[PDB]
Design a protein around this motif. Structure first.
Motif, short mmCIF file in Angstrom:
data_model
loop_
_atom_site.label_atom_id
_atom_site.label_comp_id
_atom_site.label_asym_id
_atom_site.label_seq_id
_atom_site.Cartn_x
_atom_site.Cartn_y
_atom_site.Cartn_z
N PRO A 144 2.44 -7.16 -2.71
CA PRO A 144 2.24 -6.11 -1.68
C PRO A 144 2.38 -7.53 -0.38
O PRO A 144 1.06 -7.08 -0.49
N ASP A 146 1.99 -6.26 3.83
CA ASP A 146 2.07 -5.88 4.67
C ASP A 146 3.04 -4.57 5.07
O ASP A 146 3.92 -3.90 5.00
N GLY A 147 2.53 -3.38 4.01
CA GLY A 147 3.17 -1.93 3.69
C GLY A 147 4.34 -2.21 2.69
O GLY A 147 4.80 -1.22 2.06
N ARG A 174 11.45 -2.88 1.57
CA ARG A 174 10.66 -2.39 2.05
C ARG A 174 11.48 -0.64 1.54
O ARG A 174 12.29 0.04 1.71
N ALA A 179 3.70 5.02 4.38
CA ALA A 179 2.93 4.24 2.72
C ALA A 179 1.77 5.21 2.26
O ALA A 179 2.14 5.15 1.35
N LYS A 180 1.44 6.29 2.69
CA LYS A 180 0.36 7.26 2.77
C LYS A 180 0.74 8.13 1.01
O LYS A 180 0.25 8.72 0.48
N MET A 184 1.48 2.36 -3.72
CA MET A 184 1.38 0.44 -3.78
C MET A 184 0.89 -0.15 -5.05
O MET A 184 -0.45 0.73 -5.67
#
Length: 223
Positions: A144, A146-147, A174, A179-180, A184
């Motif tokens: 991973p 940066d997101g 990407r 994200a949430k 990941m």
């Protein structure tokens, strides 16, 4: 779920390699959870293409990787919105191929949109001379950042006469899901086997098959 044991796909590709524009479309089917997949590819503009069809093969599907053990599958998580990916492939003899991709899901079908820009392929290299014989298997390394999800990859191109032309690629995957809402994974690796099954008519039509299998490192640790 939105990703099924059997998924079909459609591809629009277009771009330019050493000032030669081209458009391709593909059609295909895979078993995303088995990590296998077929692509049948027509070149529809720019034919006959002056360069080896070998430089576009990594541009024709992340949904078809078998995430073994319990590895969070970034790619399958982001549907129903889908994902993207951005790649820079650098050949050790100068050629540089930047591909941009959009993956979408509309009516149970995976739509791929691709933008290639190849530069600095040497006039006398085996790519523009069309002296290549497909790719070796390779281990891609993912992590991973940066997101996002980064892929790191050394590949080996078979050459006519024997020997290999190596290239390296940097890929940023990407998600379109925030994200949430996806879990990941950490550091892990994907073993790949990209292969040409068929070509017709000076690489005008090309059939491609892939095995992608994700894993951790099997080795014992002292830590």
């Amino acid at each position: 779920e939105l990703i099924k044991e059997n998924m079909h796909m459609k591809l629009y590709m277009e771009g330019t390699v050493n000032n030669h524009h081209f458009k391709c479309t593909s059609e295909g089917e895979g078993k995303p959870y088995e990590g296998t997949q077929t692509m049948r590819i027509k070149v529809v503009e720019g034919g006959p293409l002056p360069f080896a069809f070998d430089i576009l093969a990594t541009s024709f599907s992340r949904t078809f990787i078998n995430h073994t053990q319990g590895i969070p599958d970034f790619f399958k998580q982001s549907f129903p919105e889908g994902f993207t990916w951005e790649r820079v492939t650098t050949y050790e003899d100068g050629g540089v191929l930047t591909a941009t991709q959009d993956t979408s899901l509309q009516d149970g079908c995976l739509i791929y949109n691709v933008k290639i820009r190849g530069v600095n392929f040497p006039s006398n290299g085996p790519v523009m001379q069309k002296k290549t014989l497909g790719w070796e298997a390779n281990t891609e390394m993912l992590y991973p950042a940066d997101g996002g999800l980064e892929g790191r990859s050394d590949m080996a191109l078979k050459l006519v006469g024997g020997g290999h032309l190596i290239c390296n690629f940097k890929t940023t995957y990407r998600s379109k899901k925030p994200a949430k809402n996806l879990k990941m994974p950490g550091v892990y690796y994907v073993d790949h086997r990209l292969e040409r099954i068929k070509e017709a008519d000076k690489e005008t039509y090309v059939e491609q098959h892939e095995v992608a299998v994700a894993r951790y490192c099997d080795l014992p640790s002292k830590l």
